[PDB]
Amino acid sequence: MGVQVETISPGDGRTFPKRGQTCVVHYTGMLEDGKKFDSSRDRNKPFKFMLGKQEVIRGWEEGVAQMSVGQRAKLTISPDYAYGATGHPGIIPPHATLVFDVELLKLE
Numbered sequence: 001m002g003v004q005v006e007t008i009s010p011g012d013g014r015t016f017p018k019r020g021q022t023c024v025v026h027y028t029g030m031l032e033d034g035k036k037f038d039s040s041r042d043r044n045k046p047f048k049f050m051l052g053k054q055e056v057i058r059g060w061e062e063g064v065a066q067m068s069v070g071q072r073a074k075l076t077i078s079p080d081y082a083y084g085a086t087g088h089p090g091i092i093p094p095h096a097t098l099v100f101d102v103e104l105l106k107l108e
Contacts, residue, residue, distance in 0.1 A: 018051065
C-alpha cells in the first residue's frame with residue numbers, strides 16, 4: 001500500500017503544501033507495534049523539509065501534501081513508501097510499516 005492519512009485535529013482546510021514550499025512540522029515516528037523511534041517533540045525543535053526534494057520518505061512527500069496548515073494527522077506508511085526491504089540498521093527493521101503523528105505548523 002501507499003500512505004493512509006487519518007485526521008487527528010483539523011487545520012484550516014484551505015492551505016495545502018505545494019512543491020517547493022518548506023513544511024514546518026512536529027512529528028513522532030513509531031513502528032507498527034507502537035515503539036517510538038524518532039520524535040521532533042522530544043528535541044523541542046520543529047522539523048523543516050522542502051516538499052518535492054525527497055528530503056523525507058515518499059509517504060511524507062505524498063502524505064503531508066494532503067494536510068492543511070494547522071492540521072494534525074496520523075500517517076500510516078507501507079515499507080515501499082518508507083525504508084523498504086532494507087530499512088535502517090538498529091532503528092527500523094526490514095519491511096516495516098511506520099506510523100507518524102504529524103502536525104503541520106506552518107509553511108515557509
